[PDB]
């Protein structure tokens, strides 16, 4: 009677959970379900909330039964008794004024095992609240609300008020094969074809679960494997090919280093004869652009090192208008709190409605709001799907556009240590680092670039500089980012050593774009006028525009591409930031191709909204070219710069109906010595990293350096 999705495992576990949930809710028995993630508990919760719309039910059965309103509370080690009390009271308020024979309000506690032994011991309130609904106040009939507690962590039965407690263990091979058959049941030819594969995949899954150190893979991974293989066989209309099994296995059971999923699953099968490779970029793509049908795949978790995954994602797949929205924690002084969660979930919702893909940055603290949405258990109305989102005590059903996708970028180690196991199970996990994109020869080029860097720094007295002190913004991954950006700009061109040389030269050019002129002069001097040194001096002083920001701007306006309507540049300097008068000069130079460049100081902004207001004020002008300049003094700050960058990217992506051309410059004032805070640049991706020693046009010296490099000081006065 209830309209389940066809790919849903109509397994015994969900059957019993629904039956129990219905009977207990209808009769206000407290019911506690404990099991490992994927054990049909939260699914049963949504199904029972949807089916038990008494008069608005889908079947005459539930129309005979009571109408259920759920008030949900997500338990944590930091949850207070007042939270549980207020939840029960809100349910009572819902039950107030109604026939308790046709309506019931239920309290649902999620992850109750987390609250078990917290120092505040809030679950104590459970005992009284389940009996009558009151801790000190006088009883009433409407205060006795129904109750279901769902948890993955074990529970104390004495606190359950002697309710009904159902604890499930990890299923066995027969149960996994029955779940798989249930998933495939929608078609019998496909189900029969895949049947052989079900046993092997179950044995492999139990192997993976016993091998791994921490619970990292669970039942959702197995179920999605069965789903993806069923879909593959269904579209092919033939037995699934080894490559499809490999691809499914890799999509689901990748993300952990000590795991060799495909080797385990292949050990159970002879398909290995093909065993073609699939890269994490192919898998991430297949997730985001999954090849009319309910072939909806889990939301992505990209595990990365040093926020690297964002460069790869922005560059490779989000080249065009598919550019998603970055959901991040603000780095502005007066904005980190509750209100940031409110705005963020508003944006998540808007992207679900509109179908815009989302990137989840340092926002794991948003999971309690997204916990049920990640399950991707959908209510339906008119074909459109709705999923629950909450911000505080309020949970609401919100519309999901079939095109919506969610990518969480997090550090691998933060995920392994802190991330809750059920969150890890709800997401499809892949590891992405530049090393995983670069081929063997591209990695070799990176090694060569690091050697070239050290030579540049020291030699191809002798203070023995460090690369960070010369290539401003240099870091362990700078050369890799450079090579990635170079080859991405080159395209997918096939490998040839000619490409190797061109790529090396491009990489050198970029690093040189980030170099000090002092360093290039040194490099010539210490090479006694070497060929390399003169080539690099030519490129820096003649084929590049470090003489000021105006020269760089002019070169960028003339030479920049026409496809890239948004062009992003990051600038580091040791000089004093530009004032409004310098922007007036830039306007006089630029007028005729763009309006006055807008200069903004990130430090001057206390709130992300105040910043966004001015970004929009600029972007709303009708000029066909716009130059926005953002200024910051590196004194902490990297968070401000990053948040401002993300915001500008998002707002440009939003103001994109126009084909106008936006040039973004981020200007960071550094110190040659420093203050311990090591500026880290070469952020790669959409950005161009350029060092300018001095942004001004040098009125006191009308010369571009490298003219004095062959003139004496006496001649200056002649």
């Amino acid at each position: 009677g209830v309209p389940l999705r066809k790919t849903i495992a109509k397994n015994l576990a969900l059957k019993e959970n629904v039956f129990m949930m219905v009977v207990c809710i209808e009769l206000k028995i407290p019911l506690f379900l404990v099991g490992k993630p994927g054990s049909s508990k939260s699914l049963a919760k949504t199904i029972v909330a949807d089916a038990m719309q008494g008069p608005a039910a889908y079947s005459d059965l539930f129309r005979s039964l009571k109408q259920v309103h759920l008030v949900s509370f997500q338990c944590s080690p930091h949850s207070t008794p007042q939270g549980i009390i207020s939840t029960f009271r809100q349910c009572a308020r819902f039950q107030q004024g109604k026939d308790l024979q046709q309506y019931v309000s239920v309290v649902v506690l999620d992850e109750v095992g987390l609250a078990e032994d917290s120092p505040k011991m809030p679950l104590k309130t459970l005992h009284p609240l389940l009996e009558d609904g009151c801790i000190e106040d006088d009883p009433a009939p409407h205060k006795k609300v129904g109750f279901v507690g769902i948890s993955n962590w074990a529970l104390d039965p004495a606190k359950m008020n002697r309710g009904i407690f159902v604890s499930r263990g990890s299923p066995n091979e027969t149960e996994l094969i029955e779940s798989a058959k249930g998933i495939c049941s929608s078609d019998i030819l496909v189900q029969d074809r895949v049947q052989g594969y079900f046993a092997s995949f179950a044995k492999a899954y139990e192997t993976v679960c016993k091998r791994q150190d921490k619970e990292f893979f669970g039942l959702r991974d197995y179920y999605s494997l069965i789903k993806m293989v069923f879909a593959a066989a269904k579209a092919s209309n033939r037995k699934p090919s080894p490559q499809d099994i490999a691809q499914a296995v890799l999509r689901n059971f990748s993300g952990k280093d000590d795991i060799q999923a495909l080797d385990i699953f292949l050990a159970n099968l002879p398909e290995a004869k093909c065993s073609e490779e699939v890269s994490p970029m192919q898998l991430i793509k297949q997730n985001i652009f999954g090849p009319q049908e309910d072939a909806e795949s889990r939301y992505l978790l990209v595990l990365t090192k040093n926020y690297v995954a964002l460069q790869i994602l922005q560059q490779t797949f989000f080249e065009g208008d598919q550019q998603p929205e970055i959901i991040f924690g603000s780095g502005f002084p007066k904005d980190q709190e509750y209100t940031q969660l409110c705005r963020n979930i508003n944006r998540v919702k808007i992207c679900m409605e509109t179908g815009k893909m989302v990137l989840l940055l340092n926002l794991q603290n948003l999971y309690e709001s997204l916990y049920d949405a990640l399950n991707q258990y959908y209510v339906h109305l008119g074909g459109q799907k709705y999923v629950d989102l909450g911000l505080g005590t309020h949970r609401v059903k919100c519309r999901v556009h079939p095109n919506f996708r969610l990518i969480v970028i997090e550090e691998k180690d933060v995920v392994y240590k802190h991330f809750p196991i059920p969150l890890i199970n709800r997401l499809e996990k892949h590891y992405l680092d530049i090393n995983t994109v670069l081929e063997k020869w591209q990695k070799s080029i990176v090694e060569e670039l690091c050697a070239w860097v050290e030579k540049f720094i020291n030699v191809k007295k002798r203070h023995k500089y460090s690369p960070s002190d010369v290539f401003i913004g240099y870091h362990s991954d700078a050369c890799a980012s450079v090579v990635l950006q170079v080859i991405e700009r080159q395209g997918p061109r096939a490998l040839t050593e000619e490409l190797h040389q061109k790529v090396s030269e491009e990489a050198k050019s970029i690093l040189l774009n980030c170099a000090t002129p002092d360093a290039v002069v040194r490099l010539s001097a210490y090479s006694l006028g070497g060929f390399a040194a003169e080539w690099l001096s030519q490129e820096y002083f003649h084929r590049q525009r470090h003489n000021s920001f105006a020269d760089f701007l002019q070169a960028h306006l003339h030479t920049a591409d026409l496809e890239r309507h948004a062009i992003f540049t990051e600038i580091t300097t040791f000089s004093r930031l530009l004032t409004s008068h310098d922007c007036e000069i830039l306007e006089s130079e630029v007028t005729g191709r763009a309006p006055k460049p807008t200069l903004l100081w990130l430090q001057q902004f206390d709130t992300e909204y105040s910043f966004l207001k001015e970004v929009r004020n600029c972007l709303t002008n009708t000029a066909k070219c716009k130059i926005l300049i953002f200024q910051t003094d590196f004194e902490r700050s990297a968070q401000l710069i990053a948040s401002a960058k993300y915001s500008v990217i998002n707002e440009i992506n939003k103001i994109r109906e126009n084909e106008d051309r936006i040039f973004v410059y981020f200007i960071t004032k550094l110190s040659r010595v420093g203050r311990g805070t090591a500026y880290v640049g070469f952020h790669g991706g959409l950005w161009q990293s350029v060092h300018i020693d001095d942004l001004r046009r040098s009125t006191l010296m009308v010369s571009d350096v490298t003219r004095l490099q062959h003139v004496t000081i006496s001649q200056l006065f002649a």
């Binding site: 094969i177 209100t339 909204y609 105040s610």
Partner: protein
């Protein structure tokens, strides 16, 4: 190159680095070229005659070996299309190619063979070495060794092939790479035709082995499918099949072809019995047949053959002959092909699989059987459609005779006896009824179904609307009623689309509409469902939500759901108020901040007051609602901005309150979300010296500026307090709240008993007369002069500055200078400190303590001991002077996780600061339990 040698070989001393530098620049100029271009110039041009051992030659040789390494890593075959003039230099290049292309596991026989087969340069190396001797003579010794490895590998491979002793992985790689293998071997053998015969022999034998493996795999998979019910035990066969063949020598796994004896019939690793050979062959032929898979219900393999295989094959044979003859009964078609509905291409594949057995050929009858099964399935679907049409007739209330459909129902009731017939003998009348229902697909049946079950919704729609014209008015009312949640608002659109789609049947229909006229009135629905795939679901959703739809007409004209309307009003009229809590309430944002929502002409609702939690509830609501793709976000954004702005102001107030500041104790601020008569901010300090301050403009600019000044004043106040604490010793006995309490009370007559008690810790048994005498000396005439000065000056200073923020900074400065001018009933920290000093002097004798031995004066001493020892030790310290009164908090602090930095700070300040009258001791006990932050700040 001549200039390079000339310049390099100049005998400059080595210490200077002439040669190395010049040669580095030359190597640089070389590397700028393409690796293959470098190798081409090296070999083709005869520049080398200059002396093959000079430094330039060795530098270029180095560069060329690096080029060859790059090419080998790139897998670029450089010898293809290559040319050369100097045999020595070409031999050097060739040796570099051989050595660099070699695998890292230089001795792995299989990886050597893989290297030889996969890499093309090997072909060229063998070709060159075969053509003329001069290349081989010029080649190095490492390359000659690697060539000897290649020769040995190839000759072993050939011996294995010819004899049959080859592993299956080698044979597989050789088959995949037969061309390179045979060319390389031909070159070698000319250097030093049966191998083609051998590779063919082994390919045939390997295909046989793989055929048998795949037959056994299919049998194993079948038994694994029936695993859930029947288990088999064939340990020997499962072990044999499980072994990885690549390591296994062919002649052991299978008899190999050699005319040494007759061409023996091949025998495999399995040695399958004849029964199991037949069974596995057939099961392999039907491995993809969905009809042979099910086809059945611990066993041994002979019992598996007898029970499972023979029945299945016999039934499959009989079914295939039934299909050929057409004698297949409708019951058999219904049981077997229940799944192939809408999958007739798969049915065609299945039936050709049945044909593969090569009995009942003609491989064309299946086209007819496929069409007959299409007809049977369409017939049953037509039956379902007819039943749905009858349900729609009774639901909508039609009267047109549909007796003809009874024909299909006449079949549907006598489903069992009629089904004893064949596929072609069914009848022509049912065929005609399907011809009629042809234009209704399962989706169209689903639409009709969504209409049928909903008679109450249909009657209500017809009573309420009566026409599609009215729907729009209804929908407006519904949008007011919706509920601002996506499902709730979307219910309206679901209903609108449902009614616009099913309008023909609901409204246009005449009850006397007959069968075909009903099909055309249905064709309009056909076009609607073609344009909308979820229209039946929208209908059903509307019918499930009928009670709300009923409410729409009479009631929901009034609801006027108001969640964003509330935010809009707050933005227009709303007023946020920040003030010190009344009733001695604890200081918190909730108590400080609250919203007033008035009423305006044209809206005479109740002037409400909202609590911070209610505003946060409204916010959460706005956010979960606000996904509507509309500009309405501006109001939510204004709302959120002002909320956050005011919240920041509130927390600044709380900070100043926590710091002990006094101005912001009677201070009330009204922030008008939109101006009232030109006023956006209003501040009143509750002081007769400070008149009401009001400013207009953007509320958020004023608020940010005011917050920044409050925060600057906070840092300035923290400095001012630290300063007065260094200037006055006794202030440190107290916290900020105690200082505020005392400032207020000591001016009273009489003070509170709590305050005199708090003073007792400085002057034991303190009384009103003690404080009255302590007031002397501190109330200098200079203080009254300052008070008069500030009370007269402030009006002028405030008139000279115009913005609220400058007037407020003036007030803040002057309050730090002379607070008595603003708050006369409070003692400034200086007069308070003086009164405390006077009391302390009027008290008993100073307290003189001495540290025990082992503890150094002027030093921060530290004692480390078991928990139980901590407390007695602290006591011995004071024991040293047992005649001295007992310590108190002034001297001893017992630390807890809840111990705040203010306590440790005040202890340290009491110890180190000057002004004290005696040599007390100061103890900080159980510090390990402190938080890291507090101990850090204390240090």
């Amino acid at each position: 190159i001549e200039v390079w040698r000339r310049l390099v070989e100049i005998q400059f001393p080595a210490e200077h680095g002439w040669k190395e530098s010049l040669l580095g620049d030359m190597e640089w100029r070389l590397t700028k070229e393409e690796p293959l271009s470098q190798i081409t110039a090296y070999c083709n041009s005869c520049w080398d005659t200059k002396g093959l051992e000079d430094s330039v030659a060795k530098t270029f040789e180095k560069c060329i070996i690096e080029a060859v390494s790059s090419a080998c890593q790139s897998q670029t075959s450089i010898l293809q299309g290559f040319s050369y003039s100097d045999l020595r230099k070409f031999g050097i290049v060739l040796s570099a190619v051989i050595t660099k292309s070699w695998p890292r596991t230089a001795d792995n026989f299989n990886d050597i063979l893989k290297h030889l087969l996969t890499l093309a340069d090997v072909k060229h190396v063998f070709r060159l070495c075969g053509t003329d001797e001069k290349i081989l003579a010029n080649v190095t010794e490492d390359a000659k060794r690697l060539i000897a490895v290649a020769d040995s590998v190839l000759t072993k491979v050939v011996g294995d092939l010819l004899s049959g002793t080859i592993l299956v992985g080698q044979l597989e790689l050789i088959i995949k790479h037969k061309n390179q293998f045979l060319d390389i071997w031909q070159l070698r053998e000319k250097s030093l035709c049966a191998v083609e015969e051998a590779l063919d022999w082994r390919r045939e034998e390997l295909l046989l082995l793989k055929k048998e493996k795949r037959c056994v795999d299919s049998l194993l998979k079948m038994c694994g499918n029936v695993k859930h019910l029947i288990q088999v035990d064939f340990g020997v066969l499962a072990v044999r099949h499980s072994q990885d063949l690549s390591s296994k020598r062919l002649n052991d796994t299978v008899t190999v072809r050699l005319s040494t004896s007759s061409n023996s019939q091949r025998a495999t690793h399995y040695h399958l019995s004849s029964q199991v050979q037949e069974m596995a062959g057939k099961i392999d032929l039907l491995r993809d047949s969905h009809i042979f898979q099910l086809f059945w219900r611990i066993l041994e393999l002979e019992e598996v053959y007898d029970y499972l295989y023979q029945p299945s094959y016999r039934k499959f044979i009989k079914l295939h002959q039934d299909l050929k003859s057409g004698e297949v009964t409708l019951a058999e078609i219904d049981v077997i092909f229940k799944d192939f509905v809408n999958k007739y291409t798969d049915l065609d594949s299945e039936l050709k699989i049945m044909c593969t057995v090569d009995h009942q050929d003609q491989r064309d009858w299946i086209k007819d059987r496929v069409e007959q099964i299409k007809e049977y399935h369409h017939l049953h679907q037509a039956v379902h459609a007819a039943k749905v049409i009858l349900q729609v007739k009774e639901s909508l209330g039609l009267n047109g005779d549909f007796s003809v459909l009874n024909t299909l129902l006449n079949f549907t009731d006598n489903f069992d006896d009629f089904r004893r017939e064949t596929l072609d003998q069914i009848n022509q009348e049912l065929i005609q009824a399907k011809k009629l229902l042809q234009d209704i697909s399962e989706a169209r049946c689903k639409g009709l179904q969504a209409l049928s079950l909903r008679k109450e919704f249909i009657c209500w729609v017809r009573e309420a609307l009566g026409g599609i014209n009215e729907l729009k008015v209804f929908v407006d009312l519904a949008s007011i009623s919706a509920g601002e949640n996506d499902i709730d608002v979307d219910r309206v659109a679901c209903f609108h689309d449902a009614v616009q789609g099913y309008a023909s049947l609901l409204f246009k229909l005449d009850p006397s509409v007959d069968f075909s006229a009903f099909m055309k009135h249905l064709k309009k629905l056909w076009k609607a469902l073609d344009k909308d795939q979820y229209l039946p679901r929208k209908l059903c959703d509307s019918a499930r939500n009928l009670e709300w739809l009923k409410t729409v007409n009479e009631s929901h004209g009034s609801v006027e759901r108001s969640s964003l309307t509330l935010a809009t009003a707050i933005n227009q009229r709303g007023i946020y108020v920040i003030q010190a809590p009344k009733g001695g309430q604890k200081i918190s944002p909730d108590t400080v901040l609250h919203l007033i929502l008035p009423e305006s002409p044209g809206s005479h609702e109740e002037s409400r007051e909202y609590s911070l939690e209610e505003v946060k509830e409204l916010l959460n609501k706005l956010m979960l609602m606000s996904g509507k793709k509309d500009r309405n976000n501006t109001e939510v954004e204004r709302f959120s901005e002002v909320f956050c702005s005011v919240q920041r102001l509130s927390q600044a107030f709380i900070d100043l309150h926590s710091a002990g500041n006094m101005l912001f104790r009677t201070w009330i601020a009204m922030a008008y979300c939109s101006p009232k008569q030109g006023v956006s901010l209003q501040m009143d300090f509750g002081l007769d010296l400070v008149t009401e301050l009001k400013e207009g403009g953007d509320v958020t600019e004023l608020l940010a500026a005011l917050c920044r000044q409050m925060e600057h004043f906070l840092d300035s106040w923290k400095r001012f307090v630290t300063q007065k604490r260094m200037e006055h010793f006794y202030l440190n006995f107290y916290t900020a709240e105690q200082l505020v309490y005392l400032s207020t009370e000591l001016r009273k007559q009489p003070p509170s008993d709590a305050a005199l008690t708090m003073l007792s810790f400085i002057k034991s048994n303190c009384t009103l007369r003690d404080v009255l005498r302590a007031s002397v000396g501190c109330g200098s005439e200079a203080a009254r002069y300052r008070m008069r000065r500030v009370m007269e000056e402030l009006p002028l200073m405030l008139l000279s500055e115009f913005s609220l923020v400058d007037k407020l900074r003036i007030i803040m400065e002057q309050s730090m200078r002379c607070l008595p001018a603003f708050l006369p009933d409070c003692l400034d920290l200086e007069t308070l400190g003086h009164c405390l000093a006077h009391l302390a002097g009027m008290g008993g004798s100073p307290v003189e303590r001495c540290l025990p031995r082992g503890l150094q004066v002027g030093q921060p001493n530290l004692v480390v001991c078991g928990h139980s020892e901590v407390l007695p030790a602290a006591l011995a310290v004071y024991m040293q002077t047992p005649s001295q009164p007992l310590p108190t908090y002034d001297e001893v602090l017992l630390c807890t996780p809840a111990t705040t930095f203010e306590e440790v700070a005040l202890l340290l300040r009491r110890c180190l600061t000057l002004g004290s009258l005696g040599h007390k001791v100061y103890s900080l006990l159980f510090a390990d339990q402190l938080s890291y932050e507090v101990a850090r700040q204390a240090e």
